[PDB]
Symmetry: C6
Subunit: 216 residues, 6 copies
């Protein structure tokens, strides 16, 4: 990575941390922040490192390649490279593949990130990666949010745990999510607690809802 | 984080430490300092990191979102953003969402914390987070303090352990806590030791009380 | 902490180290140095951190609160705060609660420790803490030193191990300790080895005593 | 290694990390990035270190020697050393064996890497090493890509996992790989899912393919 | 410690390392270097730290106190403190107890070590400690070197292992050790190998001896 | 160690790493690089540290002493110390024992390594150590290379593994090794694969040989 701005190789424990994550948890929503976290300040070399050191889950990893490409081609369209001698004081325009680390050197990468104005390739690529991770997570969720219904003898607090778990992996904007929260959660609660909540009105907080259904 | 003031990505072991905590201990009062501890000097990115990397406990995590929002909206009310070009030497007023890390960049965050006067967003947000943690802890305690009573054959020292454990999670100010200490602790002791304590008067220390009931 | 003088957040492994200690060993004499060790250079924030991250042992932790208060009130008596505007170049007098970290900011704490003359709040508070730890250790020892007697078939070397173990937790000054060493140790040895030692006189070293009773 | 440019010995945990990798995973495609990752910024001493500290897998390690030599001799051919006194301000031309660390000192190595223009021996040698690793990986794969066929009751997602796993170890250029992707993957799918895919046309994404065969 | 010269608190892992050592291996000759190793650059605070954090082995630890005192009193005799105002630019003469860390502050300690000429209290005290460790090790060895005799069916290489193990813990100078090597080792070998060695003469190396008795 | 040039104590994990190695693997060829690796930049104090902290394997360790001495005496012969006052700006000539760390201080050691011209005692001694390690490894190998023969049903790849393993521990120069490679390997292969190889000629690579005997 690069700490704010002097350059560093990615640390063995960052690395090791990132590997373990994927072994243990597969593609679980939390992986994603973890990833970002482990990649704070990362160059594309470092991001590639993280990605290539995953073994197994190769269908996913392939899918992530495609996505990155899609994002790369989109970059190139918007940002077409111009012909000419890159002057002494300057540095070349980055392609998609230069962004993905594939067709750029560590110097070039370091070039783009530090230069003024900053061309934050490390952060760009990361976005594309995260993008591709969401595709995966969302695909690899077995359950839809519509399906999460409160078991007859299920404490409310567990149902909520399954709801927002399943929600965290859904393909949807916030506005949509909001709607799902405001609509479904109460709709799919078990009759006993369903009633109780209805009786609070439709603007009570979660704290209020979970404490309303606590005894039941 | 930022060490006093040069910027750093959050360390893999901080991270890993914070994850383990939540897996093992769920929402136990001690988690909270741990959190603060692990977040000394943290930016909102770092705080978000910590929070998003929790998997499971999603009802709680949702509840924590609400609270943060509540605190954010309250900020905005008191601190309304004004219209105008942010001058060359200056930086914009932070919203609630800029405080929660959501609508601000790492640069902006670094901006606010280092600038003179310091606008300590990292510490603000942390307070809001801790606030929301207390809501959770307090909710997720099964037992009320009123219920902690000394078993007939329970050594005083264990009863005390259950008392202050249960107290540490209660919703109450210090003055209230004080009262509970001064009132209940002696009230809910088993008869044998109840008497003995009464006989010391009502201003003896805990050291004195625990050593008074040691043989019994 | 602060390394000699640039400021640092307490390290995850310090933290983690301090937690494990208390889980494993409860309140064993060695904990105390460990504590000091883990707190070399610590601010009150750091010391509080250490203390609050203990879960369980809440009677003790409560007792430690009382002691700290007692020490705080004593500070205040001797060091009464004066009224007035803290001038531009100066910083306010610290209360007890400012010393315990409770009513002071990290800046203020950093202020007091670095300023000339140094007002070492980190070291003061630590003393008060250690003080309160001794109260605990001493209370939580099951055995008195008077009770440690050499088993009939007990090798001297083990008896010594139990003696100084039990001694390390006693409430006593050195002069008292000395006396206990010079008096009891030989008094409570089993007859066979009791004699042998008596025969060396009453100023022989431990090395000499343990090697005198080695065959028996 | 050397961090951008001050010199460091390779860290115990890098080391240890690299050893564990080879014990556990033998020669699995992911090892390779791991290697690169663990060697970011590495001198030939550091690279040799990594290699010599492998025990077992000595046939491979021998094969890797040969390859390195082959690459070294090729260097020498293209880059023949000239006779003469290496002037005061200069440093000698590197042989292959100077590149492999074998016939050069750490100073010389440090010389070549830092000097302007940079003669990046650390990166050269690494390429040769990685080259030799591919030879090994490719040899030590039991299965050919032609052989990966979808089991009758095999979920598509697993088949894909075996396909790209086996592909990752094949001896082939990208263009070839592309062809294999575009040709075989669909060819070797089980009849039920084979049909379904055919029906999407021959330019659909993997995401589309895996979600097309998800129910079947 | 102090790294050459900026001051540091002793690291959690140094600490932890030193504790584990004593738990696992008790007082085994190797502990000693380990100790020294773990204490490279250590102040007396750091050395005390190491020592006090040992739990159990309290007879030893007591014996080590005595020794340190003996060494301290000897210092004082040779180095008597003089009366007078320690001038502005100067620092006081160190007692034994100031050397053992007991009656000196961390500043004073830092004072003595850095000042010119260097008064290396950290290294002095360490010597006294190591001294006291040898007393212990030597006492806590069950076996004398005279007793190590080669079993009838014992491979020479194992006998040697027991010999030099037992030798490493003996109370003796080198010249004495030399003699023991040159005399006993061959004397206490089993007849078959005894002869064989005798036949090499009395100046052959260990390598030669162990390879002479390899088949037998 | 010393990082290029500011001085450091050897790290707890280096230490710990080096200990584990010797416990687990005894004297296996790979230990040696590991050693070198763990000692990059090491002073003789650090090298001694590493060596003395080995417990068990005392015959070896004794043998290593002898060797070091032999190398030390050889140094002294070639490099005889001259009589005279070591001038103000200078430093004394190093003996063998000063090289082995035994009769020199850490300052002196630091003196020799940093001074211009560099007198790299740390690297000298290391060579002598490694030398003595080879003596050991070579002795402690049970098997000779002549004895490694391919089992009738042994896959070639395993035989190769045993060959180069056993070769790595032999006492021999490269030219000799080369010969052994070019002669024996094919000679001691099982008849079926022996033939096949013979048929490739006597200049084919290992890659070619192992892939020639892969099916058989």
């Amino acid at each position: 990575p690069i700490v704010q701005m002097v350059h560093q190789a990615i640390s063995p424990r960052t690395l090791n941390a990132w590997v373990k994550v994927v072994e243990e948890k597969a593609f679980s929503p939390e992986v994603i922040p973890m990833f970002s976290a482990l990649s704070e300040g990362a160059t594309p070399q470092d991001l590639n490192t993280m990605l290539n050191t995953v073994g197994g889950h190769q269908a996913a990893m392939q899918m992530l390649k495609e996505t990155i490409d899609e994002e790369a081609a989109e970059w190139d369209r918007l940002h077409p490279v111009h012909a000419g001698p890159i002057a002494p004081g300057q540095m070349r325009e980055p392609r998609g593949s230069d962004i993905a680390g594939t067709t750029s050197t560590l110097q070039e990468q370091i070039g783009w990130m530090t230069h003024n104005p900053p061309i934050p390739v490390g952060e760009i690529y990361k976005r594309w990666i995260i993008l591709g991770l969401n595709k995966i997570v969302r695909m690899y969720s077995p359950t839809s949010i519509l399906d999460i219904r409160q078991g007859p003898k299920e404490p409310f607090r567990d149902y909520v745990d399954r709801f927002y778990k399943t929600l965290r992996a859904e393909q949807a904007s916030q506005e949509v999510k909001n709607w799902m929260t405001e609509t479904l959660l109460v709709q799919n609660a078990n009759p006993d607690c369903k009633t109780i909540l209805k009786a609070l009105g439709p603007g009570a907080t979660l704290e209020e809802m979970m404490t309303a259904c606590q005894g039941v």
